[PDB]
Amino acid sequence: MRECISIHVGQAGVQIGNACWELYCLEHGIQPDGQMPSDKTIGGGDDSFNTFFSETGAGKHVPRAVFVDLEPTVIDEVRTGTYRQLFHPEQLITGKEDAANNYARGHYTIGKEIIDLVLDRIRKLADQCTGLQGFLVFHSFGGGTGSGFTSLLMERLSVDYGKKSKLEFSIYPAPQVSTAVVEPYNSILTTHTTLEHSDCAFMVDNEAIYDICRRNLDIERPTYTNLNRLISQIVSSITASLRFDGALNVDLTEFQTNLVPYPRIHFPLATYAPVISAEKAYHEQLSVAEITNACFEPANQMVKCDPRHGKYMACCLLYRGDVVPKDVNAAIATIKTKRSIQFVDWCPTGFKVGINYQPPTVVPGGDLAKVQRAVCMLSNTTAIAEAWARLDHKFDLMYAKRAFVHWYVGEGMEEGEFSEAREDMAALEKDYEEVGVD
């Protein structure tokens, strides 16, 4: 058994961590006070849920989590909400004044005064680990904290814990819920300074989650609560193999080995089916074939792109519920006949498959219905580079006029870092095009 530390940074990061830790406790049968009646090794152990929870002498199971925000209100709602008892105070770090949607304010100005406090509260958790795998980092591209502070944190994690793997769950900016005009700036900036420090990143475009909510949850105008319970479902699919007995993605190194053959192209697409409204009166439950087929609809992806005009480098199918290999192979066989799936010439055309027999857990009184079987597909397709195209375009449009740049320079950044980051992104876009177009 080897422990994973989750770090949630900013509003988006903290609120998503809230959702995921709620979910995790439901799935592992841990209750709000932190007691786990099913754990009979009292006071410790090396079961695989211990990967995410530590144990205390009193029977309390404590997330290996740190929440960091530069302003107090959101982490205050953690400190005071239904899982108040779950977390130890030293795991919740607030500032007094936030980063005002300014990458440079979060990275340089305010990051510097709190980076050391954060690294010490992290070291405190690492010191309770017999073998630490590395880190799961939750944050948004768009916020000032979530973008700027995260990148500072990642630089210093690579120095302080250099042999450890680091994974991101990154929230990509969408105008339907975005809070700032400079969110493309922040995104490019933090992608550029975090690229070499992160081994695998799962992007989630708020536009895709938003429309999944509208279209398949019958939600008229989704809130962050709607968005976040869906996102946590997907996150739990992605992490269930660290938290449960199995032989696929049992550690963080395996995610890179299985989904990332080239280190910079480390952005796997996540597709998830089925998303079914809890207020659906009559629902015919879906087959292995139907949900695996849904995995290849763009409408089910965390980022809206078209994988038909790209190439695959890797594809994992994580099933949860009642699934057996023969149905999966039947489904794959017929899907390949009817669909445009082409891998790169230097990679097997195959699917690594993982099945956990426990169906997806859904939050009581949520939007999601219970189902008999569900799948999360993780596919490293070059088509995700569409999302960079979009972002880079917006960036160019503003930076051509240096609009808003002065807010960054006034925090101590230098105009030129804007274009070093933009040129790194140009390198990135062309890496994708080399690998996946002819």
Binding site: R156, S158, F244, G246, P325, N329, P348, I355
Partner: protein
């Protein structure tokens, strides 16, 4: 179309199906970057207060 490396346990099973074979910077470089930005900040603030002093 071959199923390979199949593993089973009470809680699940995992396998691979193949359809077709293949056809950093240092601690103080960082406190350098951060202190260069802080000094840029303090220079701009000082030019502001020299202008206000005039």
């Amino acid at each position: 179309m071959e199923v390979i490396e199949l593993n089973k346990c009470t809680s699940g099973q995992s396998f691979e199906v193949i359809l077709k074979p293949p056809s950093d910077p240092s601690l103080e470089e960082i406190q350098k970057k951060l202190e260069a930005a802080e000094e840029r900040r303090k220079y701009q603030e000082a030019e502001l207060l020299k202008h206000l002093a005039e």
